[PDB]
Amino acid sequence: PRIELRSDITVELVDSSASDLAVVKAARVSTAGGSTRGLIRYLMRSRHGSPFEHNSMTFLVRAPIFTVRHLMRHRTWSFNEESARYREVGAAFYVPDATRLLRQEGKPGDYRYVGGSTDDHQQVVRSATRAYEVAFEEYQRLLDSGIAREIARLVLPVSTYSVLYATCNARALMHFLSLRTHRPDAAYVSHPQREIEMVAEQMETAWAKLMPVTHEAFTAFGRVSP
Amino acid sequence: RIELRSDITVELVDSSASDLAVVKAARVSTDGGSTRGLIRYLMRSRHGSPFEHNSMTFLVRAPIFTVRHLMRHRTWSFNEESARYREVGAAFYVPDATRLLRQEGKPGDYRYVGGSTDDHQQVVRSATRAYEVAFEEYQRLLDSGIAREIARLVLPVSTYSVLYATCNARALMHFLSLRTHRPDAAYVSHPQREIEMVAEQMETAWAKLMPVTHEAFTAFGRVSP
Amino acid sequence: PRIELRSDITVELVDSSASDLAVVKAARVSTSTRGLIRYLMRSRHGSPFEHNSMTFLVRAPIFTVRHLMRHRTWSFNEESARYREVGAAFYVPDATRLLRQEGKPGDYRYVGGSTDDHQQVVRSATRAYEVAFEEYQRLLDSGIAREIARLVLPVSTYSVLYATCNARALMHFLSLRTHRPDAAYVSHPQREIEMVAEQMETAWAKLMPVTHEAFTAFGRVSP
Amino acid sequence: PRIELRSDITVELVDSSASDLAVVKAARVSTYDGGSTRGLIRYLMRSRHGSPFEHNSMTFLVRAPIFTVRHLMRHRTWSFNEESARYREVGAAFYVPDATRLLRQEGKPGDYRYVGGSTDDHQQVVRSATRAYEVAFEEYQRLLDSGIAREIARLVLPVSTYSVLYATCNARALMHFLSLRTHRPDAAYVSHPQREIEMVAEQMETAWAKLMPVTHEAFTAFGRVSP
Ligand SMILES: Cc1cc2nc3c(=O)[nH]c(=O)nc-3n(C[C@H](O)[C@H](O)[C@H](O)COP(=O)(O)OP(=O)(O)OC[C@H]3O[C@@H](n4cnc5c(N)ncnc54)[C@H](O)[C@@H]3O)c2cc1C
Ligand SMILES: Cc1cc2nc3c(=O)[nH]c(=O)nc-3n(C[C@H](O)[C@H](O)[C@H](O)COP(=O)(O)OP(=O)(O)OC[C@H]3O[C@@H](n4cnc5c(N)ncnc54)[C@H](O)[C@@H]3O)c2cc1C
Ligand SMILES: Cc1cc2nc3c(=O)[nH]c(=O)nc-3n(C[C@H](O)[C@H](O)[C@H](O)COP(=O)(O)OP(=O)(O)OC[C@H]3O[C@@H](n4cnc5c(N)ncnc54)[C@H](O)[C@@H]3O)c2cc1C
Ligand SMILES: Cc1cc2nc3c(=O)[nH]c(=O)nc-3n(C[C@H](O)[C@H](O)[C@H](O)COP(=O)(O)OP(=O)(O)OC[C@H]3O[C@@H](n4cnc5c(N)ncnc54)[C@H](O)[C@@H]3O)c2cc1C
Ligand SMILES: O=c1[nH]c(=O)n([C@@H]2O[C@H](COP(=O)(O)O)[C@@H](O)[C@H]2O)cc1Br
Ligand SMILES: O=c1[nH]c(=O)n([C@@H]2O[C@H](COP(=O)(O)O)[C@@H](O)[C@H]2O)cc1Br
Ligand SMILES: O=c1[nH]c(=O)n([C@@H]2O[C@H](COP(=O)(O)O)[C@@H](O)[C@H]2O)cc1Br
Ligand SMILES: O=c1[nH]c(=O)n([C@@H]2O[C@H](COP(=O)(O)O)[C@@H](O)[C@H]2O)cc1Br
């Protein structure tokens, strides 16, 4: 076992200060000392999204670099990621599991995917294994020779696992979920890559425990952020 | 009857913030040093991103001209009571007797100096007269059925407003660097006194939740990382 | 007389670098235009619409400047009353402005005022603004600092600012700050900020007419 | 198809609307022992009145390896649009450092202190990178030829693979990026970015200094801190 292949993307809530009541208090500018549902839906209907920002959630995310790229495009979040300049990188790499769709149909612009055969999945695993094993063998060879970490890592693939903290408020999370989940009955159907979708679904599940009224209204109003 | 007040109030409504939150974010917790050592190193190296993984929510009550200064900080979240939606209460700010009332030097130097007893009585007299007329006309307009969003056009920028203001500690430190006047800081900023009163109460509340960060912030010249 | 009353809200485009071709080049990462801009809006790929800029000079009363300044994706710089004495120019609504309201506060439902309602607004505004500005000048004349003297001035006092946006930020602003029955969402901005937004949209339509047409075709929502 | 190794990082200014006059106009909006423009800009720079420097725009075309694009894209005040590997097959161009790059590191990880490598160090880098990039690309093409979707085939490509994007900033955002992404031992804050993002930053700065020379002079005069 020269390297570790994994197919999992992990998201854990580290900390938070978020509830449906926090929205109602901000919207009302509440002083020290069905109505929650009605208020939260009123804000979604009127696109008064600002009260949904007065909260926070922090997630620990472990995902391949190509997926962390998609996550880090959302400029309303805060991130802090482990550095390959700073620390040697572990030989853990992502490959898609047996249920991941492997084939494409239609125009490139459609991001429409379809199932692959059992030999498609085998070919992906064979090809990834060879490429990742060679990449990590050369990375460690360079490190052993005394080459700086920030240069040695040039040979590592975008499937290399990384880990980070990602913090959002609920408004930023709903904008992220609108773009990074593919829901055919949403107001807008987005076509994100499956891997960042896996992140987003786990974030949504965690959020729905903290803010179940807002989570329900968000889907009811077409999964767009107010 | 109008009410004159001189207070600016800040109350911490809610928070999720601690120096350990910074340490965890910096280390991505899942150097063999200390919380002080790591927070100083981030502060001096301007590695400010770990200071964002937290939140504080303040309830602020201040005159409109001071809320304007608060709401220029685009890294924060705000939600304020609306005069289009609800009639405005008759509370108006006037400076207290400690406030500096005169200016010297160039306009861009914002250098204020003490006023006399006469100066302060003059300010209270003019303000009382102007705000009594404004509120009397606001009330007359509302009484004759003019819409609230139009009637408030006569109300002064000293009218109090209340809002929630939410930040993370990086955004708070950036705000403090600009909205407190500290002779000894790396950059001496010249904010108006009233927004500095808001800033100071925010900083007092913050130093309770993140004392190591608060101390490193002043140690390095009050510049946000 | 000692004060100036005006009812106009002005917007002028000061400079720009914005075109539909700038959107295409960003989307294609360049080293029909209508078809591509429509595809971006349908797919909410709004990022290519940020690679441009427009700078507006806006003159409006403070209560409306507050509404404009809530849009955090823009850049602003406004004349300071801490720095400079304030001029005696104050806003009052013109005769076409709707002056009364019905229904619940959250409906924002305005209805016409009579000729009398409008005279009453002008009479009360003149009285209040006159006293404010008399006291402001009295305090300035006594040597009280500019930043304290202006405590008496009303939220109707005019201010002036530069406001710079890219097309994505302008569309997000127009979706919230115009009331349009051809939009996906009927928003209820105050008429004065809507006057700023209408002039911005008019000037933007000359620079990026494909994008301006696609914005309305897709429901007046920012991509 | 053969791979291509390159060491260059390129930045071109695609378009702009930025000048020192645009700052002065934004700053003085209204109803010195030298030029009033340099006077005003120096005053804003030292007073950290940065807002006036936002009323402009510059758009760059940048070509760089993914690991360096990652550094550029952390700056949330900019706008970006990058070529996509989900959308289009990736070209066979891969970054390797040139012979002048420092290849060794001394001291603590947080010091970011780099020192010269030997001729043998450079050769060993080119050797290992060549071998890894050739196997990656051969496997990427094998996957593509097999009909595997391009968003999954690119899993095997290294972070040295070149990408291309537009990056748009105003001058305030550019100054904040230059303070962090250039290593200037004279600056008020000495930052230790990776050399490759520093190459991007130096080219951007050279372009910007032609569009806004008084601003650029003031930024350096005051310690390379964004207002
Ligand atoms: C009819 C009307 C009624 C209003 N009533 C009130 C009121 O009663 N009280 C009040 O204070 N304001 C009120 N506002 C102001 C409103 O809350 C917004 O501040 C203003 O409309 C700007 O909207 P925005 O935040 O979407 O835009 P911007 O600030 O321009 O932001 C654009 C988008 O960027 C994203 N974004 C930016 N910053 C963040 C962040 N920190 N977190 C998450 N996402 C972010 C969101 O997707 C946001 O929609 C009202 C506005 C209107 C139009
Ligand atoms: C003494 C003083 C005098 C002032 N004079 C005036 C005046 O005459 N007129 C006036 O209009 N305002 C004035 N202001 C307000 C000032 O211009 C800023 O609006 C306010 O200080 C908030 O600072 P900020 O923009 O740095 O903060 P934030 O909005 O919180 O932004 C924080 C930082 O994020 C970055 N940033 C955020 N958005 C952008 C962006 N779009 N482009 C580039 N970088 C961005 C910058 O690094 C910025 O410093 C003054 C403020 C003070 C304290
Ligand atoms: C030498 C070096 C080492 C680094 N080490 C790591 C690392 O180990 N891990 C890692 O993940 N990154 C690391 N980074 C990336 C770094 O954390 C920042 O993401 C990058 O430098 C952008 O800086 P910025 O956030 O200040 O800029 P921008 O994102 O452009 O923001 C500019 C300014 O706007 C304000 N601002 C904007 N958004 C917010 C917000 N949500 N809250 C509060 N203020 C805000 C702040 O004042 C900020 O300084 C490193 C960078 C350098 C130069
Ligand atoms: C299916 C898919 C395809 C994609 N294709 C590409 C691609 O080919 N190339 C590529 O580079 N990226 C691509 N992206 C990434 C995409 O362009 C965005 O970077 C990402 O989706 C984040 O969206 P956002 O900018 O709206 O979010 P955020 O950065 O979180 O911003 C949230 C909202 O704030 C506002 N906002 C924030 N900053 C600004 C600003 N400076 N100006 C104006 N408004 C602002 C806008 O309303 C924005 O929607 C793709 C993403 C998806 C989901
Ligand atoms: O010098 C740096 N610049 C950076 O931008 N970062 C970010 O931190 C993460 C890891 O970067 P690294 O290149 O693997 O060290 C990634 O998101 C980078 O964009 C890390 C360092 Br260290
Ligand atoms: O129509 C609206 N637009 C707004 O921007 N606001 C914000 O809410 C605050 C109160 O505004 P009002 O104009 O007093 O209602 C102030 O910050 C406004 O900018 C409120 C309303 Br309601
Ligand atoms: O000290 C200052 N703080 C500020 O925020 N401003 C902004 O500049 C504008 C004019 O504010 P002033 O209080 O009239 O000077 C307004 O948008 C303020 O928010 C101006 C000064 Br000067
Ligand atoms: O689905 C998408 N999500 C994305 O975020 N992107 C961004 O565009 C760039 C190219 O991503 P790709 O994963 O190589 O297609 C990178 O900056 C991504 O973050 C591109 C696509 Br397509």
Side-chain angles (χ1 to χ4, degrees):
Chain A
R2 299 185 186 181
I3 59 172
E4 185 185 14
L5 310 175
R6 319 179 63 149
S7 284
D8 63 334
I9 302 291
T10 71
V11 177
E12 293 165 51
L13 184 74
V14 171
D15 206 0
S16 68
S17 183
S19 64
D20 297 307
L21 207 213
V23 182
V24 176
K25 292 175 61 179
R28 296 183 182 309
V29 192
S30 286
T31 63
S35 61
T36 294
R37 187 182 183 275
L39 185 50
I40 284 168
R41 285 169 57 102
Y42 166 76
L43 303 169
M44 295 300 199
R45 185 158 59 251
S46 61
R47 292 187 309 169
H48 186 31
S50 175
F52 295 97
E53 298 180 9
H54 293 270
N55 50 249
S56 60
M57 290 166 276
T58 297
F59 294 103
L60 175 63
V61 177
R62 187 185 309 269
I65 291 173
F66 69 92
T67 292
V68 174
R69 299 226 295 153
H70 297 164
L71 174 58
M72 291 183 75
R73 290 307 297 276
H74 294 261
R75 283 166 295 185
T76 43
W77 289 59
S78 291
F79 299 113
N80 195 244
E81 180 181 357
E82 76 172 347
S83 169
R85 296 187 69 210
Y86 188 95
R87 301 179 158 250
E88 172 166 347
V89 172
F93 309 89
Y94 173 82
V95 301
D97 71 23
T99 57
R100 226 272 193 201
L101 304 170
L102 298 177
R103 289 194 166 256
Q104 180 150 200
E105 292 180 353
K107 291 165 167 81
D110 296 343
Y111 302 108
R112 194 154 77 259
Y113 303 99
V114 294
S117 64
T118 306
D119 282 299
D120 284 333
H121 185 255
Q122 289 172 181
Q123 190 36 262
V124 159
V125 176
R126 276 195 299 285
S127 283
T129 301
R130 179 83 212 97
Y132 300 165
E133 283 173 350
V134 167
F136 193 68
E137 175 187 330
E138 296 301 345
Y139 171 65
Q140 281 293 324
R141 195 197 312 286
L142 293 175
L143 286 179
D144 289 346
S145 290
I147 299 311
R149 280 177 308 260
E150 74 164 14
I151 294 296
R153 61 66 172 279
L154 265 46
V155 298
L156 298 177
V158 301
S159 62
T160 304
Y161 281 93
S162 193
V163 63
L164 62 276
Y165 273 31
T167 291
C168 55
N169 60 58
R171 198 189 191 179
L173 180 59
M174 283 186 280
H175 189 96
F176 167 84
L177 299 177
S178 189
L179 287 163
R180 302 296 190 180
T181 52
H182 172 260
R183 295 308 186 259
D185 70 332
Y188 291 88
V189 183
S190 194
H191 301 291
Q193 185 150 350
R194 178 66 181 139
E195 290 83 8
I196 183 69
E197 188 181 44
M198 290 166 71
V199 176
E201 293 166 339
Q202 296 179 57
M203 292 171 167
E204 186 169 351
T205 295
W207 172 56
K209 300 189 219 308
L210 304 174
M211 295 184 70
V213 180
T214 296
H215 170 269
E216 191 167 89
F218 174 66
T219 290
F221 278 86
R223 295 185 60 80
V224 298
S225 181
Chain B
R1 179 182 155 240
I2 76 171
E3 172 183 26
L4 307 170
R5 306 188 63 101
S6 291
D7 56 342
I8 302 281
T9 71
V10 172
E11 176 186 345
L12 180 71
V13 169
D14 207 0
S15 68
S16 179
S18 68
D19 292 314
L20 171 65
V22 178
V23 178
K24 286 174 69 176
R27 296 183 160 298
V28 185
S29 286
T30 312
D31 284 324
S34 55
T35 295
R36 177 181 165 96
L38 171 172
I39 282 171
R40 290 171 54 85
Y41 164 79
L42 298 170
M43 184 70 74
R44 85 192 322 158
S45 72
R46 291 197 302 170
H47 181 33
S49 180
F51 295 96
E52 297 179 12
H53 295 267
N54 49 242
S55 73
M56 291 163 276
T57 292
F58 294 104
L59 170 67
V60 176
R61 177 181 282 98
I64 291 174
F65 68 96
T66 289
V67 176
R68 294 226 298 153
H69 294 170
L70 174 56
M71 291 179 69
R72 291 309 297 279
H73 295 259
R74 283 172 293 183
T75 51
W76 290 52
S77 290
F78 300 111
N79 193 247
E80 179 180 355
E81 192 189 322
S82 164
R84 291 185 70 215
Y85 188 91
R86 187 169 298 93
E87 175 174 342
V88 182
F92 304 93
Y93 174 81
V94 298
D96 65 28
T98 88
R99 235 284 210 172
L100 301 177
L101 303 178
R102 293 181 167 266
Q103 185 165 184
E104 284 162 2
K106 299 165 136 193
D109 284 1
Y110 305 103
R111 198 173 68 252
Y112 301 93
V113 309
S116 54
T117 327
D118 181 46
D119 285 332
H120 185 250
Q121 300 171 72
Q122 212 55 61
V123 170
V124 177
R125 183 172 168 185
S126 293
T128 295
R129 174 189 187 211
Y131 300 167
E132 282 176 337
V133 169
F135 193 78
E136 188 184 311
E137 292 305 336
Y138 176 61
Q139 285 299 314
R140 207 185 310 289
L141 291 171
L142 293 181
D143 289 352
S144 65
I146 300 301
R148 287 177 289 274
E149 72 166 12
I150 296 295
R152 56 68 170 281
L153 263 47
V154 303
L155 292 179
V157 299
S158 64
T159 306
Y160 278 88
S161 192
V162 56
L163 63 165
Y164 268 33
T166 293
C167 52
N168 61 51
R170 198 194 191 174
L172 179 59
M173 284 186 275
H174 189 104
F175 170 83
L176 295 172
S177 188
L178 287 166
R179 295 302 189 180
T180 54
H181 176 256
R182 298 292 186 264
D184 38 3
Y187 293 89
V188 181
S189 184
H190 294 284
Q192 183 150 0
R193 181 63 186 133
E194 286 79 13
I195 186 69
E196 180 176 50
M197 289 163 71
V198 176
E200 288 170 342
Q201 294 178 60
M202 289 174 167
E203 179 166 1
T204 291
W206 176 56
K208 313 192 223 280
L209 296 170
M210 297 178 70
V212 176
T213 296
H214 169 260
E215 176 169 337
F217 177 65
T218 282
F220 292 103
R222 297 185 56 91
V223 182
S224 185
Chain C
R2 193 203 196 102
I3 64 170
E4 184 192 4
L5 299 184
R6 299 175 72 70
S7 299
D8 56 339
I9 299 291
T10 61
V11 170
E12 295 165 33
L13 179 72
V14 171
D15 204 8
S16 68
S17 173
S19 58
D20 298 314
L21 173 73
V23 180
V24 170
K25 283 181 66 191
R28 287 171 179 169
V29 192
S30 287
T31 60
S32 61
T33 293
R34 178 189 203 274
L36 179 53
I37 289 177
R38 285 187 155 44
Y39 164 84
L40 300 176
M41 291 259 174
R42 177 168 28 247
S43 75
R44 293 188 305 173
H45 183 30
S47 183
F49 295 96
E50 300 180 3
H51 300 262
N52 50 246
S53 68
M54 295 168 273
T55 292
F56 298 99
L57 166 75
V58 179
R59 191 157 151 67
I62 291 168
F63 72 90
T64 296
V65 177
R66 302 224 293 152
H67 292 173
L68 177 50
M69 293 184 74
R70 288 308 299 274
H71 296 260
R72 290 164 291 181
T73 45
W74 290 51
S75 295
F76 298 113
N77 195 249
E78 178 181 3
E79 190 170 17
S80 169
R82 295 184 67 216
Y83 187 88
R84 191 174 286 96
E85 181 170 335
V86 179
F90 305 90
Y91 176 83
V92 301
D94 65 20
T96 73
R97 244 287 213 165
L98 296 175
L99 297 183
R100 283 173 172 272
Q101 183 162 190
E102 60 174 20
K104 293 156 180 197
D107 303 332
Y108 299 108
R109 184 147 81 265
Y110 300 102
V111 299
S114 63
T115 310
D116 268 46
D117 279 338
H118 186 254
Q119 281 155 200
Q120 174 65 252
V121 171
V122 177
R123 191 177 325 118
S124 293
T126 298
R127 180 164 170 246
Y129 300 168
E130 285 185 352
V131 171
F133 192 73
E134 180 176 323
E135 293 304 334
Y136 176 63
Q137 285 295 324
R138 192 197 317 285
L139 292 169
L140 286 182
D141 286 348
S142 277
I144 301 301
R146 274 178 310 264
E147 73 170 12
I148 284 293
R150 61 72 168 278
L151 285 7
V152 299
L153 291 173
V155 300
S156 70
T157 302
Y158 272 86
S159 197
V160 62
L161 64 163
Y162 267 36
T164 296
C165 55
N166 57 57
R168 199 197 191 175
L170 179 57
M171 283 187 276
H172 186 103
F173 171 85
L174 298 177
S175 191
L176 290 166
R177 300 299 186 176
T178 53
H179 179 271
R180 283 283 286 267
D182 54 337
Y185 301 86
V186 176
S187 186
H188 293 300
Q190 178 150 1
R191 174 65 184 138
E192 283 82 13
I193 185 68
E194 185 179 41
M195 284 164 72
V196 169
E198 287 166 351
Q199 291 178 70
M200 283 171 170
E201 187 168 352
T202 295
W204 175 54
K206 304 182 167 76
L207 302 171
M208 299 179 68
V210 183
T211 301
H212 168 266
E213 185 174 321
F215 176 62
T216 283
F218 279 84
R220 299 177 68 74
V221 288
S222 188
Chain D
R2 215 100 161 154
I3 60 162
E4 175 189 18
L5 311 169
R6 307 185 64 104
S7 291
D8 54 340
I9 299 287
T10 70
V11 168
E12 296 158 39
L13 176 76
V14 169
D15 194 22
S16 58
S17 172
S19 67
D20 295 313
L21 170 77
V23 183
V24 169
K25 286 175 106 194
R28 290 205 172 114
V29 59
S30 176
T31 153
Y32 315 101
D33 206 73
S36 54
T37 291
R38 181 180 180 272
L40 191 209
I41 282 172
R42 293 174 52 83
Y43 167 76
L44 301 163
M45 191 57 73
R46 87 182 179 260
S47 298
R48 296 192 300 180
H49 182 29
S51 186
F53 296 97
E54 296 177 11
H55 296 265
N56 47 251
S57 180
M58 282 165 282
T59 294
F60 294 101
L61 178 59
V62 178
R63 187 173 333 268
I66 286 174
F67 71 94
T68 293
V69 180
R70 304 227 294 151
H71 303 168
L72 174 56
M73 291 182 75
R74 297 302 301 275
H75 295 261
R76 288 164 293 183
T77 42
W78 287 56
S79 291
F80 300 110
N81 195 242
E82 185 178 358
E83 199 151 77
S84 165
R86 297 185 71 206
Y87 188 86
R88 190 157 82 96
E89 176 171 338
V90 175
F94 302 94
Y95 174 80
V96 294
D98 68 21
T100 71
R101 235 272 199 192
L102 308 168
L103 300 174
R104 289 184 172 262
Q105 187 164 183
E106 304 180 326
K108 278 198 158 213
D111 283 333
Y112 294 110
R113 191 181 29 157
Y114 303 92
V115 292
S118 61
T119 299
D120 190 47
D121 292 327
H122 189 244
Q123 286 160 183
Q124 268 329 281
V125 174
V126 173
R127 179 170 178 188
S128 288
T130 297
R131 196 261 184 125
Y133 300 169
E134 293 177 325
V135 166
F137 194 72
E138 162 192 336
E139 298 303 333
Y140 174 64
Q141 285 302 306
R142 200 188 314 289
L143 292 163
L144 300 176
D145 292 350
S146 173
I148 298 312
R150 63 195 163 244
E151 71 167 22
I152 287 289
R154 55 71 170 276
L155 266 50
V156 297
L157 302 175
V159 296
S160 64
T161 299
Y162 271 92
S163 194
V164 62
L165 64 154
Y166 270 36
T168 293
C169 51
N170 60 52
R172 196 196 191 176
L174 182 59
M175 282 184 281
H176 187 95
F177 167 86
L178 291 175
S179 187
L180 287 165
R181 300 303 189 174
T182 57
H183 176 257
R184 295 293 184 270
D186 53 290
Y189 292 89
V190 183
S191 188
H192 290 293
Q194 183 148 357
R195 179 68 181 133
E196 286 76 17
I197 188 68
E198 185 178 43
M199 299 167 63
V200 172
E202 292 167 336
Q203 294 179 56
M204 283 175 173
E205 185 167 355
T206 292
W208 170 53
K210 293 166 197 175
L211 303 177
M212 295 185 68
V214 173
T215 299
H216 175 269
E217 293 290 286
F219 177 57
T220 285
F222 290 101
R224 299 181 60 79
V225 180
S226 189

